[PDB]
């Protein structure tokens, strides 16, 4: 059997035969013989004498595999590693290394001998290879030392002492041009990141700094530079606390920006339609720093350098800064949005550059801004659209043409419904002309997406184009079933046409879609059975929209579709099959939409769907969050099918159940899965996602989501987790200025309490007791954003409790301190909302606070008034300014309604009227309308002289209300994000009271109201 492969190893004239004999011979070792001494001593002899190194190593590896199953071996190798003869040392170390590579358990008995050996051989003056092998061995030694129950303090100290030597080996390998061993040493430093700190000592920041010096050194070979960039990226994922402690964020960012500024192959960039350059890895480093660190450490340095780089004579620096921003936004979208006053002009400057690489860089930046800040970018369509079209018309490179189309796509998709209509017809004609001219399927795919995005924005305004578009696009979805002979891009073009035709079905509704429903639906049911994961994905996306369009009429298709979806969700995902991951995401969304659009006919599928999804939560690689989200979607469907109307639940702790036993059982199922995926959960994205789902369901259906029958086990578990997140002590945080991801975790943790306060009302006070001091403390954070979240959350909690809140005076006095002393205008703005509410709910004497609070509210008004003077150029400030006007006026109206005779009206009413109508936060109209009803009913002198301004304000309000009603009827199905916020009236009752008021006012002032066209329409 095997011992012949050893004979071949020693003896062939062909060295490549001895080598591959050994490569196979190792494989054989596991699967007896009296004389096994012959094969050891033969191998040891060959390992140290063969002429070529590859044949030496081959014998060495066989010795080791033998080594697992000889008390003299390790002692003899430790002796050989200290031989006077450098080649004998090297081959012994290699064999020791191969032994460590077998993970034999008894190697743990030699930690000290290995530490003492390697402290020596790491600096072997005669063989760089021996130093590199010593570094490589140390990885196994550190792992061995961390298997002790308590890490030996002496091992850690010795091992830490070796770290500077490894750095020397690295410099040695770079100096000597030995890039094979440079790579291996970088693997060693990467392994240091994972180590317990007592093994690595204080070093890690210094390893980062040393890696940065290599990365920016253009004299170093590029592949070594990528290793270095990659190491720092890896340190962001595993050791960000050390990066923060050294405050290296800005140095990392600036180093990466310099590498990305190096020139690149321009013609490749402009034509290649497809990660290992220094320039590309540098962008990935920026991208990861933006996700990992607070924006002061990454985005702020970038925006500081935007002026000088964007004007540089070096086009690669103009290109570099735009691409830097393009990769900043995903990790720091809020900070990026706040810098739009600088960033948008910069993208416009970039589009006007003479160099195409800079123009492409600007386009990539815009695509990235649209993806993350959707409608916020589309507001600038008036500058962008002319520029982007001109680039499409005059493009000389395919990659510019693609990204121009894709930028146009992202803008058009989120254009305001009113504005798209001015563009819709000229746009429609241009995109179909483009579609004809271009024959590349990569380019056609991007044009089809832009067309569908027109439909999405236009809603019912798309009807004139619906039949021509489908006629045309039906050409790209022939022979769906036949995938043999199609390129990946041909598949994408087919898939995108299915997706965007179904999006047109969302724009025009079921009646206008009636012509094509059957052929298109049949075509999509072909897609689902096909062997393209991309094509199946587009089938499910098509079905998801059909569910929105046809509601319960789509139920006859359930028997057919669900079996396909279950099959899609159960597929093996492995070398992670990205196409299957996308398909599963969309199939889960299809299942959710079908469940919410079938109602009673999705009752046979509820239990099987929960079992399939629960299996994915437990076992899937990237579908956990979505699988769990879909489970709550199934619950939402079951609760709606039981005619629990959204927001109509009984408040307070439920002593039993307001839901029938079948529904409660479905709820409890998902409630258990939710809490098991937050308890001890290490991924913050998973925690964020669970908290978001729980808040949403609590908001819609009440406390029955978290508790029933007086048993608060899960409620207390939830609050425990949330409280821990607020304190920074949850498993997902314990692997300052916070990253935005970290800020989201805070926001959604606070929002659990917000939702519970509205669920519980008075009942919440006992739950709130533990979190209340922490939230009051977060209101004082050195971080402005944390203060903004906390003050905002306390105010919503106050709204949740209302007049059943036992802490009004404590909370009132805390928000008054924020209102009075906080340096941030936006924090003071958020506080003024909470202050008015607490006064509205208070039942004790507040006469002592009215005068100081009014003074502070007026100062806040004055700082916002000054900012309002220079903001034709900065919408982030304009939103804060406008929200301050709404909140302060709302709070003042609340104060007057609560205690009119403590507020001197003579100056307050005019200050109120000067900030009406509002531009945002229309919910604050509610106290103001009630105030106007009271002042006019008492014929108050102050408002009576102000009747023109008051009827003028309602003229704006009612015009806005009519636009809102029209926008709602025209819009594309399923765009109900902003529904509550666009409303001018919080209730039909307050709306009708206002109409009667305008009726009276028309009886006085000799028909002042009728004179106005808008109100004449409402008054009659």
From TrEMBL:
The ranges of the HEAT repeats are: 343-381
The UniProt entry, under Pfam families, shows:
IBN_N, TPR_IMB1, TPR_IPO5
Q: Which SMART domains match?
A: IBN_N, TOG
InterPro entries linked to this entry: ARM-like (IPR011989), ARM-type_fold (IPR016024), HEAT_type_2 (IPR021133), IMB1_TNPO1-like_TPR (IPR058584), Importin-beta_N (IPR001494), Importin_beta (IPR040122), TOG (IPR034085), TPR_IPO4/5 (IPR057672)
Give all residue intervals belonging to the Importin N-terminal domain: 1-49
A GO biological-process term: protein import into nucleus
GO molecular-function terms, A-Z: small GTPase binding
Domain of life here?
Eukaryota
- Gene Ontology cellular-component terms listed: cytoplasm; nucleus
| Transmembrane residue ranges | none
UniProt keyword list? Cytoplasm, Nucleus, Protein transport, Repeat, Transport
**Signal peptide extent:** none
Entry's localization field: Cytoplasm; Nucleus
Q: Give the chief site where it resides.
A: cytoplasm
Quote the PANTHER family the UniProt record gives.
IMPORTIN BETA
Name listed for the protein in its UniProt record: KLLA0E20769p
